[PDB]
Protein backbone atom coordinates (compact mmCIF):
# COMPACT_ATOMS: atom_id res chain seq x y z
CA UNK A 1 0.00 0.00 0.00
CA UNK A 2 0.94 3.68 0.46
CA UNK A 3 1.83 2.76 4.08
CA UNK A 4 5.31 3.96 5.18
CA UNK A 5 8.03 1.33 4.99
CA UNK A 6 10.88 0.40 7.37
CA UNK A 7 14.46 1.55 6.59
CA UNK A 8 17.05 -0.84 5.02
CA UNK A 9 18.87 -1.64 8.23
CA UNK A 10 15.50 -2.66 9.94
CA UNK A 11 15.20 -4.37 12.54
CA UNK A 12 18.65 -3.33 13.77
CA UNK A 13 19.05 0.24 14.88
CA UNK A 14 22.03 2.25 16.07
CA UNK A 15 20.32 3.95 18.99
CA UNK A 16 16.98 4.84 20.50
CA UNK A 17 15.36 8.25 20.73
CA UNK A 18 12.10 9.94 21.61
CA UNK A 19 10.29 12.66 19.83
CA UNK A 20 8.45 15.25 21.95
CA UNK A 21 6.05 17.87 20.44
CA UNK A 22 6.98 16.16 17.19
CA UNK A 23 4.60 18.00 14.77
CA UNK A 24 5.08 16.33 11.45
CA UNK A 25 8.48 14.66 12.13
CA UNK A 26 11.08 17.33 11.38
CA UNK A 27 13.66 16.66 14.05
CA UNK A 28 12.97 12.92 13.81
CA UNK A 29 14.10 12.75 10.15
CA UNK A 30 17.66 13.81 10.97
CA UNK A 31 18.05 11.17 13.62
CA UNK A 32 16.59 8.34 11.54
CA UNK A 33 19.16 9.22 8.98
CA UNK A 34 21.92 8.01 11.30
CA UNK A 35 20.10 4.79 12.13
CA UNK A 36 18.03 5.94 15.11
CA UNK A 37 14.85 4.16 16.26
CA UNK A 38 11.96 6.31 17.49
CA UNK A 39 10.42 4.51 20.45
CA UNK A 40 7.98 7.23 21.66
CA UNK A 41 6.24 10.21 20.06
CA UNK A 42 4.15 12.97 21.60
CA UNK A 43 2.03 15.47 19.58
CA UNK A 44 -1.28 17.15 20.46
CA UNK A 45 -2.38 18.14 16.95
CA UNK A 46 -4.42 15.36 15.34
CA UNK A 47 -4.02 16.57 11.79
CA UNK A 48 -0.27 16.73 12.37
CA UNK A 49 -0.34 13.18 13.83
CA UNK A 50 -2.11 12.02 10.64
CA UNK A 51 0.65 13.44 8.39
CA UNK A 52 3.34 12.08 10.73
CA UNK A 53 1.93 8.55 10.51
CA UNK A 54 1.50 8.64 6.75
CA UNK A 55 5.23 9.51 6.52
CA UNK A 56 7.17 7.59 9.20
CA UNK A 57 7.34 3.92 10.00
CA UNK A 58 5.83 3.40 13.45
CA UNK A 59 5.73 -0.26 14.59
CA UNK A 60 3.21 -0.50 17.46
CA UNK A 61 5.33 -3.32 19.02
CA UNK A 62 8.28 -0.95 19.61
CA UNK A 63 6.77 2.53 19.41
CA UNK A 64 3.80 4.44 20.75
CA UNK A 65 2.05 7.83 20.60
CA UNK A 66 0.79 10.18 23.21
CA UNK A 67 -1.44 13.16 22.58
CA UNK A 68 -1.31 15.10 25.90
CA UNK A 69 2.05 14.93 27.58
CA UNK A 70 0.55 15.81 31.00
CA UNK A 71 -1.28 12.47 31.08
CA UNK A 72 2.19 10.93 31.36
CA UNK A 73 4.06 13.41 33.55
CA UNK A 74 1.02 14.21 35.74
CA UNK A 75 2.12 17.87 35.97
CA UNK A 76 -1.55 19.01 36.30
CA UNK A 77 -2.08 16.63 39.21
CA UNK A 78 -1.62 17.60 42.89
CA UNK A 79 -0.67 15.11 45.61
CA UNK A 80 1.60 13.18 43.24
CA UNK A 81 5.17 13.33 44.59
CA UNK A 82 8.14 13.75 42.24
CA UNK A 83 9.21 10.10 42.53
CA UNK A 84 5.72 8.63 41.85
CA UNK A 85 5.45 10.94 38.83
CA UNK A 86 8.86 9.79 37.64
CA UNK A 87 7.85 6.11 38.04
CA UNK A 88 4.59 6.80 36.13
CA UNK A 89 6.51 8.51 33.32
CA UNK A 90 8.75 5.45 32.94
CA UNK A 91 5.66 3.28 32.38
CA UNK A 92 4.82 5.19 29.19
CA UNK A 93 8.21 6.42 27.94
CA UNK A 94 10.87 3.68 27.41
CA UNK A 95 14.65 4.12 27.91
CA UNK A 96 16.26 6.11 25.18
CA UNK A 97 19.64 7.51 24.30
CA UNK A 98 18.57 10.83 22.77
CA UNK A 99 15.58 13.03 23.65
CA UNK A 100 14.27 15.47 21.02
CA UNK A 101 11.77 18.29 21.88
CA UNK A 102 10.51 21.39 20.03
CA UNK A 103 8.71 22.99 23.03
CA UNK A 104 7.11 26.36 22.43
CA UNK A 105 8.06 29.69 23.95
CA UNK A 106 6.29 30.34 27.30
CA UNK A 107 7.05 32.79 30.11
CA UNK A 108 7.69 31.25 33.51
CA UNK A 109 4.94 33.34 35.10
CA UNK A 110 5.01 31.26 38.26
CA UNK A 111 8.79 31.54 38.87
CA UNK A 112 12.21 22.22 39.76
CA UNK A 113 9.46 24.71 40.39
CA UNK A 114 10.39 28.03 38.70
CA UNK A 115 9.17 26.40 35.44
CA UNK A 116 5.71 25.23 36.56
CA UNK A 117 2.82 25.99 34.19
CA UNK A 118 4.75 25.36 30.98
CA UNK A 119 5.51 22.47 28.69
CA UNK A 120 9.19 22.98 29.46
CA UNK A 121 8.39 21.58 32.90
CA UNK A 122 7.00 18.44 31.25
CA UNK A 123 10.19 18.16 29.23
CA UNK A 124 12.38 18.52 32.32
CA UNK A 125 10.31 16.02 34.29
CA UNK A 126 10.81 13.50 31.50
CA UNK A 127 14.58 14.20 31.37
CA UNK A 128 14.83 13.60 35.12
CA UNK A 129 12.76 10.43 34.93
CA UNK A 130 14.70 8.81 32.06
CA UNK A 131 18.21 10.40 32.17
CA UNK A 132 18.87 10.22 28.40
CA UNK A 133 22.62 10.37 27.53
CA UNK A 134 21.78 13.35 25.26
CA UNK A 135 19.03 15.76 24.37
CA UNK A 136 18.31 18.31 21.63
CA UNK A 137 15.84 21.09 22.30
CA UNK A 138 14.68 23.48 19.63
CA UNK A 139 13.22 26.96 20.15
CA UNK A 140 12.63 30.48 18.91
CA UNK A 141 15.59 32.49 17.55
CA UNK A 142 15.08 35.17 20.25
CA UNK A 143 14.98 32.86 23.26
CA UNK A 144 17.74 34.83 24.92
CA UNK A 145 15.77 38.07 24.85
CA UNK A 146 12.31 36.73 25.74
CA UNK A 147 10.60 38.15 28.90
CA UNK A 148 13.73 40.27 29.43
CA UNK A 149 16.12 37.28 29.50
CA UNK A 150 14.22 35.54 32.29
CA UNK A 151 13.05 32.57 30.25
CA UNK A 152 16.49 31.70 28.88
CA UNK A 153 18.18 32.16 32.22
CA UNK A 154 15.68 29.79 33.89
CA UNK A 155 15.91 27.24 31.07
CA UNK A 156 19.77 27.21 31.27
CA UNK A 157 19.84 26.99 35.04
CA UNK A 158 17.34 24.11 35.05
CA UNK A 159 19.33 22.22 32.41
CA UNK A 160 22.62 22.67 34.32
CA UNK A 161 20.89 21.51 37.59
CA UNK A 162 19.66 18.33 35.87
CA UNK A 163 23.33 17.42 35.50
CA UNK A 164 23.63 18.29 31.78
CA UNK A 165 26.27 20.35 29.96
CA UNK A 166 24.74 22.27 27.12
CA UNK A 167 26.73 22.84 23.94
CA UNK A 168 28.18 26.39 23.74
CA UNK A 169 26.38 27.27 26.98
CA UNK A 170 28.83 30.11 27.77
CA UNK A 171 28.66 31.78 24.31
CA UNK A 172 25.62 34.08 24.24
CA UNK A 173 27.02 37.09 22.36
CA UNK A 174 25.57 38.24 19.01
CA UNK A 175 27.48 35.36 17.33
CA UNK A 176 25.85 32.53 19.45
CA UNK A 177 26.56 29.21 17.72
CA UNK A 178 23.31 28.01 19.28
CA UNK A 179 21.38 30.08 16.72
CA UNK A 180 21.26 28.09 13.50
CA UNK A 181 19.85 29.42 10.21
CA UNK A 182 18.11 27.02 7.80
CA UNK A 183 19.19 29.33 4.91
CA UNK A 184 22.61 27.60 4.75
CA UNK A 185 20.85 24.39 3.65
CA UNK A 186 17.66 25.58 1.86
CA UNK A 187 16.75 28.96 0.28
CA UNK A 188 14.56 30.25 3.14
CA UNK A 189 15.37 32.63 6.03
CA UNK A 190 14.88 30.67 9.28
CA UNK A 191 16.94 31.11 12.44
CA UNK A 192 16.25 28.91 15.46
CA UNK A 193 18.09 28.26 18.70
CA UNK A 194 19.28 24.72 19.35
CA UNK A 195 20.16 23.34 22.82
CA UNK A 196 22.22 20.19 22.76
CA UNK A 197 22.76 18.59 26.18
CA UNK A 198 25.13 15.84 27.30
CA UNK A 199 24.73 13.93 30.57
CA UNK A 200 27.75 15.11 32.59
CA UNK A 201 28.64 11.70 34.14
CA UNK A 202 29.15 10.01 30.78
CA UNK A 203 31.80 12.65 30.09
CA UNK A 204 30.75 12.73 26.48
CA UNK A 205 30.72 16.34 25.36
CA UNK A 206 34.54 16.58 25.08
CA UNK A 207 35.23 19.05 22.15
CA UNK A 208 31.71 19.18 20.78
CA UNK A 209 30.49 22.61 19.59
CA UNK A 210 27.77 23.82 17.19
CA UNK A 211 30.42 26.00 15.42
CA UNK A 212 31.29 22.83 13.51
CA UNK A 213 27.79 22.87 12.01
CA UNK A 214 29.26 24.89 9.09
CA UNK A 215 31.10 21.71 8.04
CA UNK A 216 27.73 20.16 7.23
CA UNK A 217 26.65 22.84 4.75
CA UNK A 218 26.12 21.85 1.12
CA UNK A 219 28.82 22.95 -1.35
CA UNK A 220 26.04 24.27 -3.58
CA UNK A 221 22.74 25.16 -1.94
CA UNK A 222 19.69 24.20 -4.01
CA UNK A 223 18.02 27.28 -5.52
CA UNK A 224 14.38 28.23 -5.02
CA UNK A 225 13.62 27.60 -8.72
CA UNK A 226 14.83 23.99 -8.40
CA UNK A 227 12.31 23.47 -5.62
CA UNK A 228 9.39 24.66 -7.78
CA UNK A 229 7.08 22.44 -9.84
CA UNK A 230 6.78 23.17 -13.63
CA UNK A 231 2.98 23.29 -14.02
CA UNK A 232 1.08 24.38 -10.94
CA UNK A 233 -2.72 24.35 -10.74
CA UNK A 234 -4.67 27.52 -11.40
CA UNK A 235 -5.98 27.78 -7.82
CA UNK A 236 -2.54 28.84 -6.57
CA UNK A 237 -2.60 32.16 -8.52
CA UNK A 238 -3.99 34.96 -6.31
CA UNK A 239 -7.54 36.12 -7.02
CA UNK A 240 -7.78 39.61 -8.53
CA UNK A 241 -9.32 40.79 -5.26
CA UNK A 242 -6.59 39.50 -2.92
CA UNK A 243 -3.64 40.71 -5.13
CA UNK A 244 -4.98 44.25 -5.18
CA UNK A 245 -5.72 44.17 -1.45
CA UNK A 246 -2.16 42.98 -0.71
CA UNK A 247 -0.58 45.40 -3.20
CA UNK A 248 -2.41 48.49 -1.93
CA UNK A 249 -1.59 47.45 1.65
CA UNK A 250 2.12 47.38 0.88
CA UNK A 251 1.88 50.98 -0.41
CA UNK A 252 0.87 52.25 3.04
CA UNK A 253 4.23 40.93 0.88
CA UNK A 254 7.54 39.25 -0.03
CA UNK A 255 7.80 38.60 -3.78
CA UNK A 256 10.25 36.03 -5.00
CA UNK A 257 11.61 35.98 -8.55
CA UNK A 258 12.73 32.41 -9.22
CA UNK A 259 14.91 33.29 -12.23
CA UNK A 260 17.24 34.90 -9.70
CA UNK A 261 19.16 31.80 -8.50
CA UNK A 262 20.32 33.58 -5.32
CA UNK A 263 16.87 34.43 -4.05
CA UNK A 264 16.11 33.46 -0.43
CA UNK A 265 12.42 33.44 0.71
CA UNK A 266 11.18 34.94 3.92
CA UNK A 267 10.35 32.54 6.73
CA UNK A 268 7.44 30.33 5.84
CA UNK A 269 5.25 31.25 8.91
CA UNK A 270 2.40 29.70 10.80
CA UNK A 271 0.36 32.69 9.31
CA UNK A 272 1.08 31.48 5.69
CA UNK A 273 -2.27 29.70 5.39
CA UNK A 274 -4.20 32.99 5.41
CA UNK A 275 -3.06 34.41 2.06
CA UNK A 276 0.49 33.28 1.21
CA UNK A 277 1.64 36.90 1.44
CA UNK A 278 5.17 36.31 2.85
CA UNK A 279 6.25 34.24 -0.15
CA UNK A 280 4.68 34.98 -3.49
CA UNK A 281 6.07 33.59 -6.78
CA UNK A 282 6.16 36.19 -9.54
CA UNK A 283 4.69 35.08 -12.88
CA UNK A 284 5.67 38.04 -15.06
CA UNK A 285 4.06 41.02 -13.40
CA UNK A 286 5.11 44.37 -14.83
CA UNK A 287 5.38 46.84 -11.95
CA UNK A 288 5.23 49.84 -14.28
CA UNK A 289 1.90 48.67 -15.79
CA UNK A 290 0.45 47.86 -12.39
CA UNK A 291 1.26 51.31 -11.14
CA UNK A 292 0.03 52.73 -14.50
CA UNK A 293 -3.24 50.72 -14.47
CA UNK A 294 -3.72 47.86 -12.03
CA UNK A 295 -6.53 46.03 -13.89
CA UNK A 296 -4.66 45.97 -17.21
CA UNK A 297 -5.92 42.80 -19.03
CA UNK A 298 -2.50 41.43 -20.06
CA UNK A 299 -0.78 42.33 -16.79
CA UNK A 300 -3.76 40.69 -14.99
CA UNK A 301 -2.78 37.50 -16.76
CA UNK A 302 0.45 37.72 -14.70
CA UNK A 303 -0.62 37.85 -11.02
CA UNK A 304 1.74 36.18 -8.54
CA UNK A 305 1.03 32.75 -7.02
CA UNK A 306 1.23 31.08 -3.59
CA UNK A 307 3.64 28.25 -2.89
CA UNK A 308 1.90 24.82 -3.18
CA UNK A 309 2.01 22.31 -0.28
CA UNK A 310 4.51 20.19 -2.28
CA UNK A 311 6.75 23.27 -2.64
CA UNK A 312 6.48 23.99 1.11
CA UNK A 313 7.54 20.41 1.82
CA UNK A 314 10.64 20.98 -0.33
CA UNK A 315 11.36 24.36 1.27
CA UNK A 316 11.35 22.70 4.74
CA UNK A 317 13.37 19.63 3.60
CA UNK A 318 10.68 16.94 3.83
CA UNK A 319 10.83 16.38 0.09
CA UNK A 320 13.61 16.28 -2.50
CA UNK A 321 13.86 18.58 -5.57
CA UNK A 322 11.76 17.22 -8.43
CA UNK A 323 10.25 14.52 -6.21
CA UNK A 324 6.81 13.87 -4.73
CA UNK A 325 7.35 11.22 -2.01
CA UNK A 326 6.02 13.09 1.04
CA UNK A 327 2.37 12.17 1.47
CA UNK A 328 0.20 15.16 2.42
CA UNK A 329 -3.08 13.66 3.70
CA UNK A 330 -4.52 16.97 4.92
CA UNK A 331 -6.20 20.00 3.28
CA UNK A 332 -3.96 22.73 1.77
CA UNK A 333 -4.64 25.02 4.73
CA UNK A 334 -3.67 22.22 7.12
CA UNK A 335 -0.51 21.52 5.15
CA UNK A 336 0.55 25.24 5.20
CA UNK A 337 0.03 25.34 9.01
CA UNK A 338 2.07 22.15 9.56
CA UNK A 339 4.96 23.23 7.24
CA UNK A 340 5.01 26.73 8.84
CA UNK A 341 5.21 25.06 12.28
CA UNK A 342 8.04 22.58 11.53
CA UNK A 343 11.78 22.78 11.65
CA UNK A 344 13.98 22.67 8.57
CA UNK A 345 14.89 19.01 8.24
CA UNK A 346 18.51 19.38 7.03
CA UNK A 347 19.29 21.61 10.07
CA UNK A 348 18.64 18.59 12.30
CA UNK A 349 20.17 16.05 9.90
CA UNK A 350 23.34 18.14 10.34
CA UNK A 351 23.02 18.23 14.19
CA UNK A 352 22.54 14.46 14.09
CA UNK A 353 25.73 14.09 11.99
CA UNK A 354 27.80 16.03 14.54
CA UNK A 355 26.33 13.84 17.29
CA UNK A 356 26.61 10.43 15.61
CA UNK A 357 30.05 9.56 17.07
CA UNK A 358 28.98 10.66 20.58
CA UNK A 359 25.78 8.64 20.37
CA UNK A 360 27.89 5.63 19.32
CA UNK A 361 30.09 6.11 22.42
CA UNK A 362 26.92 6.36 24.51
CA UNK A 363 25.34 3.17 23.07
CA UNK A 364 28.63 1.35 23.53
CA UNK A 365 28.93 2.57 27.14
CA UNK A 366 25.51 1.16 28.14
CA UNK A 367 26.04 -2.10 26.28
CA UNK A 368 29.08 -2.03 28.66
The CATH homologous superfamily of the largest domain: Vaccinia Virus protein VP39
CATH topology of the largest domain: Rossmann fold
Instruction: Determine and state the CATH class of the largest domain.
Output: Alpha Beta
Q: Strand tally, please?
A: 10
Q: Please report which band the strand proportion falls in: under 5%, 5-15%, 15-25%, 25-35%, 35-45% or over 45%.
A: 5-15%
| Topology pattern, helix = H, strand = E | EHEHEHHEHEHEEEHEEHHHH
What is the radius of gyration?
Answer: 22 Å
How far apart the termini lie comes to 41 Å
Give the overall shape, derived from the CA principal axes.
Answer: globular
How many domains is the backbone divided into?
A: 2
Instruction: Decide which structural class fits the backbone.
Output: alpha/beta
Q: Profile the largest sheet.
A: 8 strands, mixed
Tell me the CATH architecture of the largest domain.
Answer: 3-Layer(aba) Sandwich
Q: What is the share of helical residues?
A: 25-40%
Number of helices: 11
In short:
Helices cover about 30% and strands about 10% of the residues.
Topology summary:
Blueprint: E1 15-20, H1 26-32, E2 36-42, H2 46-55, E3 64-66, H3 70-73, H4 82-92, E4 98-101, H5 119-130, E5 134-140, H6 150-161, E6 164-166, E7 179-181, E8 191-199, H7 240-251, E9 255-256, E10 280-281, H8 287-292, H9 309-316, H10 332-341, H11 345-366
Parallel strand pairs: 1-2, 1-4, 2-3, 4-5, 9-10
Antiparallel strand pairs: 5-8, 6-8, 7-8
Helix pairs in contact: 1-11, 4-5, 9-10
Amino acid sequence: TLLPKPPEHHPHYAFRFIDLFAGIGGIRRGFESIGGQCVFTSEWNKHAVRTYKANHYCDPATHHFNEDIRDITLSHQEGVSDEAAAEHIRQHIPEHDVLLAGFPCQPFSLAACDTQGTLFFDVVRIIDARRPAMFVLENVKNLKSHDKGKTFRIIMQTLDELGYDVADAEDNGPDDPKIIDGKHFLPQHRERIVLVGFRRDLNLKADFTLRDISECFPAQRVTLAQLLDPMVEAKYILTPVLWKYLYRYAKKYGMVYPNNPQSVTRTLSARYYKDGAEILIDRGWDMATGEKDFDDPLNQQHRPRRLTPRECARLMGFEAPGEAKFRIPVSDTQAYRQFGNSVVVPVFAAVAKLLEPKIKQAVALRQE
